[PDB]
Design a protein around this ligand. Structure first.
Ligand SMILES: [Cl-]
Ligand SMILES: [Cl-]
Length: 164
């Protein structure tokens, strides 16, 4: 299992513009287009992202290209972020994925806000971190996904994703 398979399970794949769990226009594999309520603004953002007149729909290959760009951006963002870098650097390869997953979903700014959880992860206090991570809007709004990511942080294994 790897970061791509992980996020593919968490985000799914849709080739037409759709609304994510927060009601925002999105496409492909969790690629947020805009927080704006206008489907037209969304269509504009899509065409600009893809480089062609899509009219609201893309191909699987286009979807995978956006996905690759997004994962790369997330990793690079983490690596330049003063608060995230140290944490990421202290973790093993499996747990790196759980952190990238959160950043992919909430943005680095949002993740950088889990200060207490972040210190616990740095200290490798797994069970404590898991409890703290659960005390969040994130857990309450998307509990099944949050549980998968949290279990990953807690165990350092892919068990939460095996069988999906
Ligand atoms: Cl809470
Ligand atoms: Cl969920």
């Amino acid at each position: 299992m790897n970061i791509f398979e992980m996020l593919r399970i968490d985000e799914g794949l849709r080739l037409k513009i759709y609304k994510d769990t927060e009601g925002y226009y999105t496409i492909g594999i969790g690629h947020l287009l805009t927080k704006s309520p206008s489907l037209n603004a969304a269509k504009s953002e899509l065409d600009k992202a893809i480089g062609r007149n899509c009219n609201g729909v893309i191909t699987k290959d286009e979807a995978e290209k956006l996905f690759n760009q997004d994962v790369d951006a997330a990793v690079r963002g983490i690596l330049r972020n003063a608060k995230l870098k140290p944490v990421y650097a202290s973790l093993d390869a499996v747990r790196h994925c759980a952190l990238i997953n959160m950043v992919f979903q909430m943005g680095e700014t949002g993740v950088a806000g889990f200060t207490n959880s972040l210190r616990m992860l740095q200290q490798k206090r797994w069970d404590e971190a898991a409890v703290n991570l659960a005390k969040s809007r994130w857990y309450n709004q998307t509990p099944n996904r949050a549980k998968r990511v949290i279990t990953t942080f807690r165990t350092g294994t892919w068990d939460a994703y095996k069988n999906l």
